[PDB]
């Protein structure tokens, strides 16, 4: 086998958003020049796609030129403290590393040899994105600007899409006037703040508004099985995502959708926001804290581990990041054959996993 990952491993791409690598492979398969050797297959893509990777000290957009599928006789599963869970072939590479006076020093380690306590590299800040254009009756904003994203923030944070009706509950009357004002501004349709008998609420009665908001990917409400972040938000610029997130939080988020929680970790990473995920019973809890409680550094040119409050003093001393170092809590070998997948990029690394992780093929 080569250096490869489980088919459910999420990958952030420009062309398809956040997608499991087996589903990306099915879309790029054979679209180019193909080489088959037994159970392994390589395609040199006729049209390279765009993914994200570590390059010149930043997490940025990069080209991906080749795809791979084969079989591995077993896998390694690595669980870290922030909640990353990555399933990879034993020779797949990850990065350990340290913070020094002149930036990060990294070191490749095969997944088979990662042990608990290792500080592996994960992605805290994603640079990238561009304004997305969207698809008469209710007027619709033609690009996904900051105002539309702010509206969608409030909506998905505490709004439902009953009937052909939109309802948004809260206190803080200024938030609710803001939502109605933005609704009139963007869509030309307003609502009245019906002081409901539980608390205050805004309600907009427009059958075609809930419909285009559904087409945008807005969930009918929270507490739904397939709750997901609208695709276009992951692909948007940083200021748009900030307009969304500042509205979505008025700090923890409980969901029943594994996928939606993972997508949220990517959305927050696009703002450099440190995020953890935990699973209580069947529910997922996305917690929004800027780094771990201990940080691996180089002092005296020698390795050391510093608590957070000594690390911050040392870091302010030297001028301080897109990458941080998560702590492994569990390494497991799974002796089970499965299909594995890979994507070749110019940097020989890419950003994937249930939470943004720097993977090295
Ligand atoms: Ni290498
Ligand atoms: Ni940056
Ligand atoms: Ni509220």
Author numbering: -2 to 132, 137 to 251, 256 to 294, 297 to 327, 336 to 376
Q: Could you pull the original sentences from the published paper?
A:
Inteins catalyze their removal from a host protein through protein splicing. The HINT domain catalyzes the protein splicing reaction, whereas HEN domains often function independently of the HINT domain. In this study, we elucidated crystal structures of HEN-associated archaeal inteins inserted at the same insertion site (VMA-b), which is located within the A subunit P-loop of the vascular-type ATP synthase (VMA) from Thermococcus litoralis (Tli) and Pyrococcus horikoshii (Pho). The two three-dimensional structures highlighted a modular architecture consisting of HINT, HEN, and an accessory domain (ACD).
